[model samples]
Target: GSSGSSGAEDNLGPLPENWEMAYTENGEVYFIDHNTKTTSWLDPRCLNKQQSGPSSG
Candidate 1:
């Protein structure tokens, strides 16, 4: 098997079909899941990082 690269820019989170990321007026990050009209103040993937499971790298 080939070696794996660590996380990158777009690799910051898990992508769902309707999940779209945008910038706030302050150039901050936010996630919007159009399917359910859900708006997350921060990256949803990062929220689940240690809470979801352990993948310390």
Candidate 2:
């Protein structure tokens, strides 16, 4: 889960390709996909992948 920064998205603007949305919670990283609105556990090693799957995957 994210730390819930105030107006974080507003300051950050839209999401970027090839970059994973990350937030720190309890000293761990969580990844979020703004376009897909799907979130899951993230491993820093997997951030290099630049492929986007179908809207439903």
Candidate 3:
């Protein structure tokens, strides 16, 4: 089920088997790329609003 708000629950999905939390920015969440050694946004919508890179915080 999906929520109707932009909370953390809505920002993230079930953790992938090998993926780990990279960082979060603005209203988006990111994940650690096991192969690329970089961070990627969890949501495509986020990419449109912000750039992808390591978390600033």
TM-score of each: 0.46, 0.33, 0.30
**Per-residue lDDT of 1-57 in model 3, one digit per residue for the tens?**
696555333464565555577545565657775645656656333333343555573
Model 1 Cα RMSD, 1 decimal = 8.0
lDDT of 1 at 29: 86
Residue 29 alpha-carbon offset, candidate 3, angstroms? 2.1
RMSD from true fold, candidate 3: 9.8
The runs of at least 3 residues in candidate 3 whose Cα sits more than 4 Å from the true structure, single-residue gaps closed, are 1-17, 25-28, 43-57
Kindly give the stretch of ten consecutive residues in candidate 1 with the minimal lDDT sum: 48-57
- Judged by TM-score relative to the true structure, which candidate is superior, 1 or 3? 1
Candidate 1 off by > 4 Å: 1-14, 46-57
lDDT of 1: 0.64
* Winner by lDDT between candidate 2 and candidate 1: 1
Best by TM-score: 1
Ranking by TM-score: 1, 2, 3
TM-score of model 1 vs. true structure: 0.46
